[PDB]
Ligand SMILES: Cc1cc(=O)oc2cc(C(F)(F)S(N)(=O)=O)ccc12
């Protein structure tokens with residue numbers, strides 16, 4: 001209730017370390033993925049994305065981004081395999097995007113920034129609940145998917161059209177029966193490394209799995225994202241753009257590739 005961090009000039013990523021010292025930690029995210037240095041790991045098991053039974057419930061503008069929330073009271077939508085040991089349950093997805101197509105993603109590929117990045121957040125069921133999971137090194141698994149501007153993503157339109165109803169901070173809307181499988185690219189080839197949440201509290205509890213294949217969304221679709229507001233209703237308009245944290249030092253970590 002007393003957090004004041006954001007993405008503006010005076011409360012942006014370069015200021016976060018004051019209230020959250022872990023911002024300068026040993027396994028912070030996002031990071032630049034240097035494709036020539038990432039090594040193929042033949043030991044990585046196949047990635048398993050089982051979203052057939054996913055049950056979305058609501059979409060919320062939290063003043064930073066918008067979250068599409070799922071019912072995670074049961075083992076429906078889960079992520080397993082890949083670098084993961086155990087079962088991770090989908091709790092929500094959100095995006096990070098820019099003010100222009102040339103920036104917006106958190107992770108970068110050989111320093112290339114994509115227009116946006118989708119994050120599907122999952123928590124390790126061995127810890128019982130999300131709050132307990134974020135206190136563990138292997139508590140979360142976040143699946144990251146890059147977005148580039150070109151052809152429209154049919155599966156994203158239902159999200160785009162509901163944004164008018166959650167323009168400002170604190171607004172939410174019913175959002176049932178949304179199928180996240182419609183946001184995935186064809187290939188599940190990925191890079192993986194141990195990291196953190198990319199907004200405060202910046203906890204170092206995430207196994208990052210970033211897909212190599214980006215999805216394409218249309219200019220009209222991303223333009224709608226850019227019409228959202230960071231501010232609450234009745235306050236001066238601050239367009240919700242550039243809600244991404246820049247790449248952090250890789251330090252003592254190796255990024256592994258699931259493909260050759
Ligand atoms: C506390 C928490 C709960 C949750 O369901 O999702 C989150 C997502 C993020 C993130 F958006 F910053 S990221 N990018 O690290 O996923 C940060 C914190 C949470």
Ligand SMILES: [Zn+2]
Nearest residue numbers: 094096119198
């Ligand atoms: Zn995120």
